[PDB]
Design a protein around this ligand. Structure first.
Ligand code: CA
Ligand code: CA
Ligand code: CL
Ligand code: CL
Ligand code: CL
Ligand code: CL
Ligand code: NA
Ligand code: NA
Lengths: 135, 158, 157, 134
C-alpha cells in the first residue's frame, strides 16, 4: 500500500491510496485502500487521510473518516485524533499500521503503531523529511 | 496554511537488523524524489488532486513499493490492484478494486471520478470502462518482480 | 427495549403509478417479515440472527430488489451486493458483484464468520463461498418478468 | 436495495443491507450497500443503520457512519442526526434516498427524502407498523 495527501495554495485538500494487497492473498479480498472513509478520505472542512496497515481493522473502524469526524464533530486537533485512532482504537481491535494526514490549517501527521512506515513530507519551498523507522 | 504534501510506501514490520543500509538508501532516495516532485508541483500552483495523483502514480511505477509495478502476488500467483482518490473541494471520489490489466490503478480511479457519475468500479467492469475512456490494456506480468515472487514462495513454505 | 426496522428501498413510489393490489402485496410482505423479526427478538434471538434472517426473507421475496427479483444490469445480468455488521464485536462481512450465490446476505455473513476478512468481490467471493459449502446457483434464478420489463422501459427512454 | 436493523434483549445492535443495484447499471459499479460505514453500520455504543438510495452520495458522505459519529462525537439525538444526514447533507451532494436506524436506547427512525420508502418497524411484544408513502 502507498498513498499521498496534499494541501494546495488554493486551500484544497486531496488524498489517494493504491495497493497490490497482501502476499498470498485470498483472490477477491478487498482491504481499506479503495474504500472511501476507510483507507482514503478528503474534505476541505477537516482533513485529507491515506492509510496503510492490516486492512480489515481500518474498514471496521472507518479509520480515515474517523480522523475527520473526531476533528469536525469532536473538536480534536489533528494530533489528538491521530493518537486516538492509530495508538488507541486500531490496536484495541487488533489492527496495526499507520496513516498520513494533513488538516485544512496545514498541520501534517504521520502516525504509525508498527516498527516502521516508509514516509516523507514537505512544505512547498522547504526541504523534505524522509523516514522508515520510529523517531 | 502553507501548501504541503505527505506520502507513504506502507507500514509494517521493518527492522534495522533485517535491513541493509544499501536497501535503506534506495527507499530514502525513492521517497525523497517523489515528495520533491510533489513539493515543486504545489509551489507551481498545481492542484492538491493533481499532486496526490502524480505522487501515487510514481509510487506505483517504483518497483520498491507494493502498488502497480512491484505489487505483491495473490495465493494464485496473480496481481489484484486497488486504488482510491478523493477531492476535498467537491467531495467527489473514484475507486477501482480487483484490477489486473491497468498499469496505474490511481489513474483508473481518477477516470471513474472524472469521466463517470460513479464512485467505485471493480474487476472486468472497471477495466472495460477504462478501455472505453482510452486507457490501454497491459499484460498482468508487467507488475511481477523476483523480490515479491520470492516472498510468495517463502510465505507458502511458512 | 428490543426493536426491529426493515426497508425494501427508497425512491419514486407514487400513488398515481401504483395499484391498490400492488400496495397490499407490499404491505403484506413487509408486515410478515417485520413480525418474523419481532417474534425472534421476543424469543431472545440475537440482533445479528434477526437482521440476517429479515434480509434473507427480503432476498427471497421477488417484490424487492435483492436476491430473487434483483434488477437487471445494462448487459441483462444480475450483480448482487450485501453487508452485515455486528455492533457487539464490530466485525463485518460484505460481498460485491456476485451473480451465482442465492442469498448475498448469507455470503456476507460467511465472509465475517468463516474468514479473517471483511469484504470479498466477484468470482473470488463466489469461489470462497463454494469452498465453505455454499451452493452455486444458475444466474437466471433471480430473473423476473417485472424487472426485465423495467429494463426494456429504461432502454426506450 | 433492502435492509434490517435490530436491538436485541441483551442490548446488542446489528445491521444488514442487500441489493441488486439499479436497472440498466454499468457492469462493475458498486454502490453504498456492501460498503461498511456507507450503506451498513452497527456499533453497540451508538447505532445500527441500513441505507437505500442513489448510491454514490451515501459513499461520499459515509452516511451510515456519519449518523453514528454525529451522535457519539456531536452529541446529536438519533432524530437530529437523521435530519442532518438525510434531509440536509445527502440532498446537498445531489443524493436521494433514506435509511433505517436504531440507537442503543431503542429509539427507531426511518427518514427518507424520496416520494416513498418501503418500510416497517416494531418493538418486541408490540404491534408492527408498515409504510410506503410519506
Ligand atoms: Ca445463530
Ligand atoms: Ca402498543
Ligand atoms: Cl534507525
Ligand atoms: Cl493482457
Ligand atoms: Cl383493488
Ligand atoms: Cl403509506
Ligand atoms: Na510500485
Ligand atoms: Na428479493
Amino acid at each position: 500500500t502507498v498513498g499521498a495527501v496534499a494541501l494546495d495554495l488554493d486551500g484544497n485538500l486531496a488524498a489517494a491510496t493504491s495497493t497490490g494487497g497482501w502476499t498470498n492473498k485470498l483472490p477477491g479480498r478487498v482491504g481499506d485502500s479503495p474504500l472511501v472513509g476507510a483507507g482514503c478520505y478528503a474534505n476541505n472542512a477537516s482533513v485529507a487521510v491515506s492509510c496503510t496497515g492490516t486492512g480489515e481493522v481500518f474498514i471496521r473502524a472507518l479509520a480515515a473518516y474517523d480522523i475527520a469526524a473526531l476533528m469536525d464533530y469532536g473538536g480534536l486537533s489533528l494530533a489528538e485524533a491521530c493518537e486516538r485512532v492509530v495508538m488507541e482504537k486500531l490496536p484495541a481491535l487488533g489492527g496495526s499500521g499507520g496513516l498520513i494526514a494533513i488538516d485544512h490549517e496545514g498541520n501534517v501527521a504521520l502516525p504509525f503503531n508498527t516498527e516502521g512506515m516508509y514516509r516523507a513530507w514537505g512544505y512547498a519551498g522547504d526541504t523534505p523529511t524522509t523516514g522508515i523507522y520510529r523517531e | 496554511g502553507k501548501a504541503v504534501i505527505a506520502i507513504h510506501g506502507g507500514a509494517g514490520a521493518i527492522s534495522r537488523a533485517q535491513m541493509s543500509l544499501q536497501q535503506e538508501l534506495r527507499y530514502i532516495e525513492a521517497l525523497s524524489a517523489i515528495v520533491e516532485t510533489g513539493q515543486k508541483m504545489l509551489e507551481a500552483g498545481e492542484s492538491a488532486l493533481d499532486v496526490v495523483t502524480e505522487a501515487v502514480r510514481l509510487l506505483e511505477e517504483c518497483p520498491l513499493f507494493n502498488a502497480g509495478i512491484g505489487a505483491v502476488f495473490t495465493r494464485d500467483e496473480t496481481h489484484e490492484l486497488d486504488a482510491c482518490v478523493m477531492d476535498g473541494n467537491t467531495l467527489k471520489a473514484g475507486a477501482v478494486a480487483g484490477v489486473s490489466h491497468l498499469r496505474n490503478p490511481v489513474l483508473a480511479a481518477r477516470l471513474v471520478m472524472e469521466q463517470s457519475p460513479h464512485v467505485m468500479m471493480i474487476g472486468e467492469g472497471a477495466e472495460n470502462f477504462a478501455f472505453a475512456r482510452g486507457m490501454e490494456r497491459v499484460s498482468p506480468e508487467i507488475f511481477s518482480t523476483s523480490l515479491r515472487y520470492e516472498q510468495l514462495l517463502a510465505a507458502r513454505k511458512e
